[PDB]
Amino acid sequence: EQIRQAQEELAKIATQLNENPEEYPGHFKALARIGETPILAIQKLCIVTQMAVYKDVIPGYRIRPLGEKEVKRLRTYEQALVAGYHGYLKTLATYAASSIPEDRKGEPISSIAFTCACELVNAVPHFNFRGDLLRILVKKLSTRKIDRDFVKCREALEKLFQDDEEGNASQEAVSLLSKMMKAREYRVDESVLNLFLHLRLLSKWEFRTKKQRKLLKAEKEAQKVMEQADATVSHEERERIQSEILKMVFATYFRILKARVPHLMGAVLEGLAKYAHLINQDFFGDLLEALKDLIRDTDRDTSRESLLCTVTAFALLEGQDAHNARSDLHLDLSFFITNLYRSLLSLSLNPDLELGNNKINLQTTTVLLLRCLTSVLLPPWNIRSVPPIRLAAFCKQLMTLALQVPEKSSQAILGLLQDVVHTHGRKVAALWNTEERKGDGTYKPLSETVEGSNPFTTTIWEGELLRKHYCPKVREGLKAMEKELRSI
Amino acid sequence: LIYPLVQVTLGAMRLIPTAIYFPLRFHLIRSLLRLSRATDTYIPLASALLEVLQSAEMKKPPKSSTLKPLDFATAYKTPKSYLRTRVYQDGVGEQVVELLSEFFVLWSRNIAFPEFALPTIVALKRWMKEM
């Protein structure tokens, strides 16, 4: 068939350019015209072969436009390379945007175009027309419709972000993603936001003549001074591109928070918690203040958003750098601890507690509650310097929580207090012993502050309801806590 | 067979929380209270009853209508006439009061009643304040 004839020409050009590419600069245009045949069979074969050859022939550097014997032939070959690559990317872009549904004879031409574009992104990012290549991928990621091509484009950008060591390819993609997110009014699939989380920038005696020996000695000294200067310039350029990406990444994060996109705030807060330590100190205190405003706005669904911010606030301080700067930067989580305390009673009555490697973006509100409680009562730092009053206030409120929550939520809280009793012990033992009860006031359940309530003046009585709870796991869970208490 | 029974009971309970199935939801509570009262097992309905009370219709003002109040012992759904009717919101209103009292009177003697009833009391004062 004519496909056999076309296949022969494809094999001819590709092998011919592989062996000696300079001699035949017109094969790039030859690969073009035979691609405008109107049979879909050859068009699929032409596109793949063009991807194969260009990966073989693209050099390790960009080539400038000329404008204005062996030198002249290299100029002609390089100019032919750019012209073909520019034309190839235009053809790939048109096919990718073309209609996908066709006859069920296999993957359409669009799927091959995405496959070809993804391979070029991970193989030749440094070369010219990177934006035209990246615009094909980003245009696919702006549709909110998951298919095989959507995953393939996402996986390609994930690889590019975490293998970019210079930063130029990452910056150009981040600018495209940020602009697209704003242009779509943040109606994206939140897998594009997770791409920001993958940024790596943000984490034999050969004889030698008399003259031959003198040239190498001169070359070595020239290379030594160039290496020293290259090391210095590399540090400054890496830091500058990091600042530019940090500007675009953080600006997108805040604009989502201001517009309050419900399906993106979990992803945004993970990014803020991940990358807050890379920015200026004076902005770190602002992040906590911005979190407080979001919680106060929800205080005016809503339960999850306030719990998301509280998880982020503690995760911000759990970092070693932020922990050592507690006193210096005035990072007080007293607001979040109090707010988490006054919300425990309301969270019990909420029926949607169960309607559902990440540290912030978690789908279950009960899980978010457990993460906050672990931060307050079992911090990574200073676990045995926690104020006893704070421990007692939450312990009493948590038994009240366990009374009126679904079986699994009650079991989770029961297990949590088992660890709290085990790690601290005598700080909360008097709550289960009536003789050790304090007699310097009356217990205040609905206090506005943790210390305002007098929790050592009460006794944990809830065991007499949870011992007859319908769930055997809860009953065994309660028995687990007393076994720890009896072993204190 | 107590654990599997109330699991599927609360499951068929919490399938779709809508006004159409409020009488259906009400009957499932009564089955649970009877099981808990005959035995001595704890079944938490405080969220279930209060979720009834915090739906849209008892917040929105009703409409003036006149017809026969429905008997809450033979219905699995709500006829379309009751969507904003004064009669319906009263009809559920007597119910939510009744099962709340029945649930709370069961555990009205155990050592830990004040804490068992504390979150419900705060919720009810809150709901009264908004109404």
């Binding site: 978690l362 899980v367 457990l370 297990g415 | 599927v8």
Partner: peptide, 20 residues
């Protein structure tokens, strides 16, 4: 220990303990 094990999101599917 126990708090971390119950804090993972794959604890709260909804599987009934009659259909093990």
């Amino acid at each position: 220990n126990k708090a971390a094990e119950m804090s993972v999101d794959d604890f709260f599917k909804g599987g009934f303990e009659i259909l093990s």
